[PDB]
Amino acid sequence: MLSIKDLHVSVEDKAILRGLSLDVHPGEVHAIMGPNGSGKSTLSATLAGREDYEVTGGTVEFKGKDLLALSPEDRAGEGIFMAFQYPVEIPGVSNQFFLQTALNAVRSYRGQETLDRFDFQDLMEEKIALLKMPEDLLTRSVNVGFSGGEKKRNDILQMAVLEPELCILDESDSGLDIDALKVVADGVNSLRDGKRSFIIVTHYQRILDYIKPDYVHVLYQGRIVKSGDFTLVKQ
Amino acid sequence: MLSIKDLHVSVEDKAILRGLSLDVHPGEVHAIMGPNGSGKSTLSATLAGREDYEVTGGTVEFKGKDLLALSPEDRAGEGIFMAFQYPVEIPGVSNQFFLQTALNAVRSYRGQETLDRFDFQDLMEEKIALLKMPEDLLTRSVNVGFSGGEKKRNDILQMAVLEPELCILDESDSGLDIDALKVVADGVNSLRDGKRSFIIVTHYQRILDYIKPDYVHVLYQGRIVKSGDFTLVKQLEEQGYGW
Amino acid sequence: SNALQQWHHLFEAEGTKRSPQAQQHLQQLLRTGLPTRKHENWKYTPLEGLINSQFVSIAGEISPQQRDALALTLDSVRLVFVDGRYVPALSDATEGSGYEVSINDDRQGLPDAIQAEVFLHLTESLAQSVTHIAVKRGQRPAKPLLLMHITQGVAGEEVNTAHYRHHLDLAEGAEATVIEHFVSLNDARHFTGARFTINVAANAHLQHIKLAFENPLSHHFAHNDLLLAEDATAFSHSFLLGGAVLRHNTSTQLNGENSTLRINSLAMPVKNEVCDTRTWLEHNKGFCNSRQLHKTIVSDKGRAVFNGLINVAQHAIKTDGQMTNNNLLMGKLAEVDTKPQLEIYADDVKCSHGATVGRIDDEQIFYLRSRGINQQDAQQMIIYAFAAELTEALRDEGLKQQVLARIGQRLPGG
Amino acid sequence: LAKGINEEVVRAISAKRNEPEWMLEFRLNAYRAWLEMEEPHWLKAHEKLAEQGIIFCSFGEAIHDHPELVRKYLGTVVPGNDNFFAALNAAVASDGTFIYVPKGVRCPMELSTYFRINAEKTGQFERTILVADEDSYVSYIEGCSAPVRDSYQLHAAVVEVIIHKNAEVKYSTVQNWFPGDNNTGGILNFVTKRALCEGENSKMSWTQSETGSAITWKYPSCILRGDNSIGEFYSVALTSGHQQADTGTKMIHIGKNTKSTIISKGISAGHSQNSYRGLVKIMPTATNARNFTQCDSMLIGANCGAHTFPYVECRNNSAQLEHEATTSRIGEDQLFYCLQRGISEEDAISMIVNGFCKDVFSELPLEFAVEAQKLLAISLEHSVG
């Protein structure tokens, strides 16, 4: 479903990424590793549609459409979701209003329709339970008063609700613990239908113990210098 | 000696204290009780030299000098200290500077002279521990951000520093739980040289358990209608009189 | 300028008997004249469009269908005014409503102005009649009083002008809600002016709501007065959305102790518009608390102007007052000019203000877009949230929703 | 200086010292512009070192020994004709201070013209020019403490500061005047002080404690032209008796990523009126401008007044500005609480006020902080009551 080819991207005037190629097929879990400054979070930012990232070469296309020409909301409509490394607080906007508006948006974009409130909050209850969220989540302003763990799990809940085709975790395992990680793992894993694919950009690799990658890739000075299966070890 | 002679004191035109007489000698602890509105607070304020309490007829004398003719700062110099029921916040002003100023003032008065950094320092570290105040108290602004109990304890810490001869607790036991009450008590008791005297104006009777008074007086309508030792406090419950 | 003389001729116009009060106002209007951009209080608010224009006072007439097409959906006691003129046919019977209402030109009992300025005078002189509204002692009417103003322009470069004047007396212990609604019949530009004086007696509770909803090309210049006795409560919420140039004044005196005052406004300039919202508050007695929240959202080369002043009279002790102005600038060419002001003649008081100027959080926007929500919908969620504190004070849900729609029309949507 | 001012007076003040004729016409244009001006009433009721490149000297000395330097920088910030008293100052001014700091040079010590004068006050007009070239640091302290006349005496200073790329200037002012009983009150402090951050990464910091003028009219300003430039302003102002003050700062944000901080503590006593008046202005070019303004007032007694008139004009949508203002007082219970601990009313009031001003005095050079606080103390005693 996803094909990225010879990607030269630069912010700052950076040399961030000089030629990266990755091809992802439906039903696959890919892990992405490396040291900081390799550009992995830039990879995520470029896929998500962050504005200040200049693409100086190559292309990224998703199901045969050029992704790089699409706005963030359109890339989301196409089924790309990103779990943020630092989920944003949006005071004054309830989780319910947010998730419902987004859901209606992507249902519309996909030519499908639409959740009755009755069923929508059943879905919500199910996902709240699944990720062990506060039961009042719907009426609380998004991520306000949440710890890092709660924000991470919240974004995974969003992932569960909006039903994306390609899910990217962008250093989303940061600052979590063994079993907050079991929880996000449960949430992510409950989403494997053999259709969806997952790109895990790792802060550190223990996440891959609870979400096991079918493939593993390693970044250096932006570039993929290694690939393999679940089994890869260091030093 | 504190000799309170014949006191009639009126407040915003109302006579509150009517002809009160009390004598206090060095080393002694006196407790003053009553229902609210019997003139406890008024007595405290009169002794402190609060300007809104007009003594109408009546007299108060401390250490051979007329007390009512002295300004509040002068009465402080003479050794009168009042632990307030509602201590004040003084923003921007550290406890160290405030204390140091008070101490140097009352020391300049009395013809003593300014303290050396070492003994002020030692004394502070020492009292701060005794009253379980925050370690950083010296750099904090006076009473700022403190709970009520912390303010009470802060002023007893002040009492332990400024070297008063006559200490009046003016309902300063108010809103204190048992542990706070104890710490305050240890504070006051550590100040007993047999020289200092103590007048405890009581909000609630419980503080008398921690500091045992030599004398107990009951204010009704501005004067003392009953007197005795500690036992008095119990006794009244049996006599159907209370307070 | 030529404008003063035109207004003068409108004053002295055919077959119009004018009260002594109106003439007195006209003369001080003519004495001070019109302010320039170098006046202290006129720096940011343009008069150039208004003072070169040809003015006419033409009272037209409208059908009930047009009215209800423009009207709020609300259950109320509704008085309808067209082009400075009370229209009985379009109004509701006020008897037994709890409101004693009389429309006429007798001004003998009307209070003096708290702060006098040129346009207050203009409105006072050109007002064709006065609405005398009284709520009797202890009464708490079941329905809110709604004053609807329908103003229209005329063909040509002529500016049709209309001036409305109301006075409401809340008797001791009375509790009432009153709403000002301002709309344009059509897109022809017009010059509106309005003055609502309210007297709040002891233990009386007032809720005042002003909705200035008129067309993008018009001019709206209004001055309101609130007089509070002791133990009195007054809330005033103004949502100023409409007009090309809008300048609103609310002047309040707290003349008695233990009174509560709260004054809010919302300004949302789009497209070259200037929205000026001003307050004047005097604590003349102590033990009063006052709170003010003034929010502006500026788009599109728009200009928001805030001015507010808290004067604490000598000896008014235990005054508690606060003023807040929060401004959000989304246009690169957008401007906000804000001057919160304290004049404090008493030491034992607590008075503070704060004023902020801020942007849209880009990170929030991106976060919302990344889940599939369109950029504009996102920005609207955030903006709505920013004005939510103001719109949430409207207790009537039906009314609130309409106001939120009116707000929505000026957003990047609809 | 009186009697009178005409063209010939200007020409005499010039040429009593050997003055190059560019200087002369600076004076002349000043005078000519001053004639066309009206007189504003919108205020209230009117150490041996061998440098290291550094020049610390007199205004006139600078004219004589360093003409090109003075000529390129003078009137650059505060032109003759800038305003009434500044124009009157450009002509007529002899006294003043010139400071130049060459590139890459951090001044080893703190430059000070501050002197404690027990002589009756010296003079009416002066001009200071401070120039910090690239990579420069200088801390300058300015002021006097003197008794004052029973005549209205007009002190109108003009201070121009120019801070180039990557340079920082710390400018301090301590002025305290003592007029017992109420004579004048008084003195007229009309000063135009302005700093230009030119001057990418440039930083300017104003710091002031001021006491005992009849009327004070001042708005020390930072013009932040350079990208990432920084203005800062810290002010303590006291008024007592019948003294009046209209005082504040003007931060004009032009360059990108400009930051400004304003902290003012006004103190008002007796029948006096103290007003803060200031402006935070953001041009459309100043992107990601940031300002934080805090204006606090303290009233002592029921007969005084304290006023606050901030101006915020923001034409940019990347700006973040926060402005706070708060009212404080010395209460009966605070005062008595101090007394009962043996502190006199005087020392108590001095102490409380000094606590109120802590955040400003922090920003002074420590020695001058102490100086400022003692002088504030004695002024407080003499006129409070």
Side-chain angles (χ1 to χ4, degrees):
Chain A
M1 56 168 65
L2 179 70
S3 188
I4 159 181
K5 22 207 161 305
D6 188 4
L7 201 56
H8 292 258
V9 179
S10 273
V11 205
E12 312 267 8
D13 283 34
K14 275 143 173 114
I16 327 173
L17 296 171
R18 349 182 187 169
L20 188 147
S21 299
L22 176 60
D23 294 27
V24 177
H25 296 101
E28 294 182 343
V29 181
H30 292 247
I32 279 180
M33 313 171 180
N36 289 284
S38 316
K40 41 172 168 182
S41 107
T42 293
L43 173 59
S44 295
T46 304
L47 297 184
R50 291 198 161 281
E51 196 176 35
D52 294 311
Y53 295 64
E54 257 273 314
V55 62
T56 54
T59 51
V60 177
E61 58 189 44
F62 180 70
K63 294 194 288 187
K65 310 178 166 188
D66 177 30
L67 187 73
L68 260 39
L70 290 181
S71 63
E73 53 268 54
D74 280 354
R75 305 186 190 198
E78 295 282 316
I80 299 190
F81 179 95
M82 186 177 80
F84 281 49
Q85 181 175 17
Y86 303 116
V88 186
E89 306 191 16
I90 312 184
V93 179
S94 66
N95 283 295
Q96 164 148 41
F97 183 54
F98 163 64
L99 279 176
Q100 209 156 33
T101 303
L103 187 66
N104 292 336
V106 297
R107 288 298 176 91
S108 175
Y109 187 99
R110 293 166 203 189
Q112 40 193 266
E113 243 198 312
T114 182
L115 282 206
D116 185 309
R117 183 181 176 183
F118 191 7
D119 321 283
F120 171 82
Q121 278 160 60
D122 276 290
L123 172 59
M124 210 58 44
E125 283 189 3
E126 234 151 53
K127 301 312 174 182
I128 291 180
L130 188 59
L131 275 104
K132 309 190 107 57
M133 292 279 81
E135 295 187 353
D136 57 3
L137 186 72
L138 289 163
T139 59
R140 292 169 66 173
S141 283
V142 178
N143 283 349
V144 173
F146 270 12
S147 68
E150 300 176 312
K151 293 176 178 187
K152 301 302 166 63
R153 301 206 303 279
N154 189 30
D155 258 25
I156 305 301
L157 178 147
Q158 301 170 12
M159 179 183 297
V161 171
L162 301 166
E163 280 200 297
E165 285 184 6
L166 179 64
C167 310
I168 306 167
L169 312 189
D170 166 47
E171 305 204 45
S172 161
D173 63 294
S174 172
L176 288 180
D177 44 48
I178 307 314
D179 225 86
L181 242 47
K182 177 171 70 62
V183 181
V184 45
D186 297 324
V188 175
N189 288 329
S190 79
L191 298 177
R192 305 200 205 185
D193 52 351
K195 283 189 201 300
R196 289 189 189 87
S197 293
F198 301 85
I199 301 175
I200 308 171
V201 177
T202 60
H203 198 75
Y204 186 35
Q205 45 250 28
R206 180 134 195 303
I207 180 69
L208 306 186
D209 297 10
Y210 306 94
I211 310 171
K212 28 154 37 179
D214 305 286
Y215 301 94
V216 173
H217 312 279
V218 175
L219 281 75
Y220 175 74
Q221 285 286 28
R223 319 333 313 141
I224 292 185
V225 299
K226 197 74 179 184
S227 182
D229 52 53
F230 179 56
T231 70
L232 273 79
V233 284
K234 187 177 317 180
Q235 296 298 100
Chain B
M1 165 175 176
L2 181 71
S3 189
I4 302 173
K5 341 153 227 164
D6 66 23
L7 235 61
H8 299 80
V9 179
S10 56
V11 186
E12 190 134 331
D13 86 9
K14 310 264 192 19
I16 308 293
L17 297 178
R18 320 169 193 287
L20 179 150
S21 299
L22 178 67
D23 291 316
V24 179
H25 287 90
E28 294 184 344
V29 177
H30 294 252
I32 285 80
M33 312 184 63
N36 216 326
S38 280
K40 327 184 257 178
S41 312
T42 297
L43 183 275
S44 293
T46 304
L47 290 181
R50 251 165 155 86
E51 29 171 58
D52 286 17
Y53 295 70
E54 183 181 60
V55 173
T56 61
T59 34
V60 174
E61 137 68 53
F62 188 62
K63 276 191 305 188
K65 307 161 229 188
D66 175 34
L67 193 71
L68 304 187
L70 298 185
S71 63
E73 50 266 53
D74 288 1
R75 303 192 190 186
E78 291 294 324
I80 298 197
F81 182 105
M82 185 172 71
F84 281 62
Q85 177 171 7
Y86 306 98
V88 183
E89 303 195 18
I90 314 173
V93 182
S94 76
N95 282 287
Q96 188 175 1
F97 183 70
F98 176 76
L99 285 170
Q100 216 151 32
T101 295
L103 194 54
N104 284 13
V106 302
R107 282 235 181 191
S108 171
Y109 191 107
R110 312 172 177 172
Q112 308 175 314
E113 291 180 60
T114 309
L115 246 178
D116 65 311
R117 37 180 200 170
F118 287 51
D119 310 351
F120 177 91
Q121 179 166 330
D122 284 288
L123 180 61
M124 228 53 53
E125 181 182 12
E126 210 199 301
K127 296 314 166 68
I128 289 184
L130 182 51
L131 285 107
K132 310 199 125 51
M133 307 291 297
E135 295 186 3
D136 67 326
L137 183 76
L138 284 191
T139 51
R140 300 179 63 144
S141 303
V142 172
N143 282 323
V144 172
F146 270 6
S147 68
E150 296 179 81
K151 285 173 178 152
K152 309 288 171 59
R153 300 208 310 277
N154 191 21
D155 273 341
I156 285 110
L157 176 144
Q158 289 175 15
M159 191 189 290
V161 175
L162 308 171
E163 311 155 4
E165 283 186 0
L166 177 61
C167 303
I168 308 170
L169 319 195
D170 175 47
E171 307 191 37
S172 66
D173 52 295
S174 181
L176 289 181
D177 60 10
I178 309 168
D179 299 279
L181 223 51
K182 239 221 288 186
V183 173
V184 165
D186 303 18
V188 175
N189 283 343
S190 76
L191 295 178
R192 297 220 225 181
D193 42 9
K195 206 164 46 186
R196 297 190 182 84
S197 293
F198 300 86
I199 300 179
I200 306 177
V201 177
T202 279
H203 195 137
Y204 292 116
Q205 60 180 300
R206 183 152 279 289
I207 187 188
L208 295 183
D209 291 325
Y210 301 89
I211 317 168
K212 184 203 97 186
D214 304 333
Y215 299 85
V216 181
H217 313 280
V218 186
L219 288 194
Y220 187 47
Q221 244 34 191
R223 215 191 108 174
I224 297 170
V225 293
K226 259 290 193 158
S227 288
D229 55 17
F230 43 89
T231 54
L232 177 60
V233 182
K234 176 201 165 14
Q235 170 165 20
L236 291 187
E237 281 57 358
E238 302 172 48
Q239 278 187 330
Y241 275 32
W243 287 279
Chain C
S1 324
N2 180 33
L4 290 173
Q5 260 135 346
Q6 294 195 65
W7 295 341
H8 195 177
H9 283 151
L10 289 182
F11 188 87
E12 288 164 3
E14 324 166 21
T16 57
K17 146 187 173 227
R18 306 207 160 265
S19 54
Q21 292 75 18
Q23 285 180 344
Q24 185 174 354
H25 275 293
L26 173 89
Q27 268 162 84
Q28 213 72 311
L29 164 62
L30 295 180
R31 188 168 283 113
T32 63
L34 292 170
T36 64
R37 283 278 198 148
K38 210 135 37 157
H39 188 286
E40 163 63 19
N41 295 336
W42 290 91
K43 188 169 179 231
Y44 319 112
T45 309
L47 293 188
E48 286 81 358
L50 194 65
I51 80 187
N52 305 291
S53 287
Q54 233 60 24
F55 287 92
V56 300
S57 184
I58 296 182
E61 282 311 325
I62 68 158
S63 72
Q65 297 91 12
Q66 293 170 297
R67 178 199 63 188
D68 313 350
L70 296 166
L72 286 174
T73 300
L74 186 71
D75 183 35
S76 69
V77 183
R78 182 178 59 187
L79 302 181
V80 176
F81 302 77
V82 176
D83 293 328
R85 249 260 295 268
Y86 172 64
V87 187
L90 291 172
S91 297
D92 296 5
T94 68
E95 292 226 16
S97 60
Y99 304 100
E100 333 300 309
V101 174
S102 304
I103 295 89
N104 61 73
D105 220 17
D106 177 29
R107 310 201 177 181
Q108 187 130 351
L110 291 184
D112 295 315
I114 298 167
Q115 93 159 303
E117 52 98 19
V118 52
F119 285 101
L120 182 157
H121 291 308
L122 180 57
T123 296
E124 285 284 18
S125 66
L126 288 193
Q128 298 172 43
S129 69
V130 179
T131 308
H132 302 280
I133 320 173
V135 179
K136 25 187 54 180
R137 163 192 169 92
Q139 301 305 284
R140 181 181 171 262
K143 299 182 184 209
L145 181 71
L146 169 65
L147 312 176
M148 181 179 180
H149 314 74
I150 307 155
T151 306
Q152 62 185 312
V154 302
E157 293 142 293
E158 289 182 319
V159 183
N160 188 24
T161 184
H163 297 266
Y164 309 89
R165 181 73 168 83
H166 316 296
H167 183 74
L168 165 62
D169 272 26
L170 291 185
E172 190 167 302
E175 315 186 44
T177 295
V178 56
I179 296 122
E180 322 176 48
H181 188 41
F182 290 87
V183 292
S184 314
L185 183 58
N186 56 44
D187 296 342
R189 70 164 171 166
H190 59 79
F191 175 38
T192 299
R195 178 150 171 75
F196 195 1
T197 58
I198 306 178
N199 219 285
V200 182
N203 309 272
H205 290 61
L206 165 69
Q207 172 150 92
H208 167 266
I209 300 159
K210 179 160 185 287
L211 314 165
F213 288 176
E214 300 153 300
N215 67 36
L217 298 183
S218 298
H219 284 245
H220 182 100
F221 280 63
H223 202 136
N224 285 346
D225 281 22
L226 308 179
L227 288 80
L228 282 73
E230 75 287 348
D231 291 313
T233 307
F235 307 134
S236 169
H237 315 274
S238 292
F239 301 83
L240 317 164
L241 318 143
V245 176
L246 188 142
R247 183 157 160 126
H248 175 80
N249 299 269
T250 301
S251 293
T252 313
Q253 279 178 339
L254 306 174
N255 293 324
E257 300 192 341
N258 299 313
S259 291
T260 299
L261 171 78
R262 169 175 287 283
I263 294 175
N264 298 343
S265 71
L266 176 66
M268 296 187 72
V270 300
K271 309 135 172 179
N272 290 312
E273 295 172 354
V274 178
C275 204
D276 191 353
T277 171
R278 313 175 82 82
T279 63
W280 173 289
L281 168 59
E282 308 174 6
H283 285 247
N284 297 322
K285 296 299 188 309
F287 305 97
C288 290
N289 76 88
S290 68
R291 300 288 190 270
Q292 289 190 50
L293 182 60
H294 296 280
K295 296 206 169 202
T296 74
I297 305 154
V298 193
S299 320
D300 301 341
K301 258 262 324 172
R303 194 200 305 254
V305 179
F306 172 71
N307 190 97
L309 169 69
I310 311 186
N311 184 285
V312 180
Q314 187 185 9
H315 298 124
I317 56 151
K318 305 300 171 55
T319 283
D320 194 323
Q322 300 183 353
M323 171 184 296
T324 297
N325 168 233
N326 302 126
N327 311 281
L328 184 66
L329 300 187
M330 300 175 305
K332 286 192 194 187
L333 298 181
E335 181 176 3
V336 54
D337 305 283
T338 167
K339 323 200 313 179
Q341 300 176 313
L342 301 174
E343 297 177 355
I344 298 181
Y345 300 99
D347 73 313
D348 177 19
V349 296
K350 298 183 296 199
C351 267
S352 56
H353 60 56
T356 61
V357 184
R359 48 179 197 273
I360 282 291
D361 186 341
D362 287 329
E363 193 53 34
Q364 291 182 344
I365 288 304
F366 180 74
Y367 186 78
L368 283 133
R369 292 172 76 178
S370 74
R371 272 71 179 125
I373 301 185
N374 182 39
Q375 179 173 22
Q376 297 185 352
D377 294 342
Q379 286 181 336
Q380 287 175 194
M381 298 169 70
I382 293 188
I383 288 160
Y384 270 123
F386 182 84
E389 199 171 6
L390 291 180
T391 53
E392 222 63 51
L394 293 167
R395 288 300 175 251
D396 187 309
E397 177 68 18
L399 184 55
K400 172 180 163 199
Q401 291 303 325
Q402 298 179 79
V403 177
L404 284 173
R406 177 70 184 188
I407 289 176
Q409 293 175 28
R410 315 173 66 95
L411 290 181
Chain D
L1 158 74
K3 247 284 285 186
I5 171 181
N6 75 338
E7 183 195 303
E8 295 303 319
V9 168
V10 169
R11 283 193 208 273
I13 311 180
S14 189
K16 158 175 151 21
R17 304 135 188 92
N18 158 47
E19 273 201 10
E21 91 165 16
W22 52 265
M23 187 65 247
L24 199 168
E25 206 191 328
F26 174 73
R27 304 203 181 253
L28 276 198
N29 308 115
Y31 172 73
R32 310 254 174 88
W34 181 78
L35 295 179
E36 307 304 321
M37 288 170 195
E38 197 286 336
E39 148 185 285
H41 267 216
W42 42 277
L43 65 322
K44 316 302 201 144
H46 169 202
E47 164 158 325
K48 87 230 184 193
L49 185 131
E51 320 307 307
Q52 229 162 358
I54 308 171
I55 305 172
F56 189 20
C57 73
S58 172
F59 187 29
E61 291 195 10
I63 309 289
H64 191 273
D65 312 339
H66 308 89
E68 296 85 358
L69 206 50
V70 175
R71 193 224 190 104
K72 80 183 283 200
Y73 284 129
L74 164 135
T76 295
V77 191
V78 191
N81 92 339
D82 181 71
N83 60 72
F84 191 72
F85 302 98
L88 191 63
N89 182 280
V92 168
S94 296
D95 303 26
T97 295
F98 189 84
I99 286 169
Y100 176 84
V101 198
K103 318 192 168 48
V105 173
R106 295 193 118 247
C107 195
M109 48 181 54
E110 304 179 308
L111 315 185
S112 153
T113 72
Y114 179 76
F115 288 129
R116 216 163 177 174
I117 302 184
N118 201 4
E120 189 175 5
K121 203 24 178 64
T122 301
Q124 300 196 331
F125 304 83
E126 44 171 310
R127 195 177 212 94
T128 299
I129 298 174
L130 196 156
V131 180
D133 222 326
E134 309 186 10
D135 291 274
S136 198
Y137 177 91
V138 55
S139 181
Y140 172 58
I141 302 96
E142 151 197 75
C144 76
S145 152
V148 45
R149 281 244 181 186
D150 208 335
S151 53
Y152 273 169
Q153 295 296 101
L154 171 132
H155 169 217
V158 169
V159 174
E160 308 178 47
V161 187
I162 302 89
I163 324 101
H164 298 286
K165 180 173 178 179
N166 279 90
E168 180 184 354
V169 169
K170 186 182 181 61
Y171 200 107
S172 316
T173 297
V174 185
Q175 267 161 4
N176 300 267
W177 284 297
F178 308 90
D181 68 282
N182 287 15
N183 58 313
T184 331
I187 157 185
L188 312 182
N189 201 33
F190 302 155
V191 186
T192 303
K193 298 180 183 183
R194 197 177 295 143
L196 170 68
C197 305
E198 182 268 323
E200 174 176 351
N201 292 127
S202 180
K203 181 183 173 182
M204 175 60 178
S205 182
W206 300 103
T207 315
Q208 348 171 170
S209 178
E210 203 138 15
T211 285
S213 313
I215 294 194
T216 305
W217 205 9
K218 261 197 328 178
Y219 311 96
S221 305
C222 304
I223 300 181
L224 316 169
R225 180 189 292 158
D227 295 345
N228 304 285
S229 43
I230 295 172
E232 296 180 19
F233 174 82
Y234 308 95
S235 158
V236 173
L238 167 75
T239 66
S240 46
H242 284 75
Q243 302 164 334
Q244 325 204 10
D246 208 285
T247 268
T249 180
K250 281 172 184 344
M251 296 290 173
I252 281 67
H253 291 252
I254 296 161
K256 304 180 174 304
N257 311 302
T258 52
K259 193 205 187 332
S260 69
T261 304
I262 304 164
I263 298 177
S264 148
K265 315 274 170 153
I267 303 105
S268 188
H271 296 75
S272 66
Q273 307 265 309
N274 195 346
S275 302
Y276 171 89
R277 193 183 301 279
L279 167 79
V280 174
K281 181 168 195 179
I282 289 82
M283 300 299 192
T285 64
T287 272
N288 287 91
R290 285 155 64 212
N291 160 265
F292 174 78
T293 304
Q294 182 182 319
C295 306
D296 308 319
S297 326
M298 174 172 290
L299 304 99
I300 309 188
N303 299 118
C304 60
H307 314 305
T308 311
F309 309 112
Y311 290 78
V312 184
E313 314 174 6
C314 179
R315 230 175 304 157
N316 189 306
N317 70 349
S318 53
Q320 295 184 281
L321 324 172
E322 176 179 343
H323 170 87
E324 311 183 350
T326 309
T327 306
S328 292
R329 95 197 200 84
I330 305 187
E332 292 87 357
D333 284 22
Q334 326 190 40
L335 203 44
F336 185 83
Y337 180 78
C338 291
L339 306 180
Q340 206 285 325
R341 299 284 175 262
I343 316 171
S344 61
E345 168 163 300
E346 251 153 71
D347 293 298
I349 289 169
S350 179
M351 180 180 70
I352 300 168
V353 174
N354 273 339
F356 172 80
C357 305
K358 169 180 172 46
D359 279 334
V360 174
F361 291 146
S362 312
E363 299 295 330
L364 277 172
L366 194 134
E367 43 281 28
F368 297 100
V370 178
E371 176 79 10
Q373 294 191 69
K374 268 304 175 103
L375 299 188
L376 178 55
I378 58 186
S379 172
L380 270 178
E381 153 54 5
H382 284 170
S383 211
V384 79

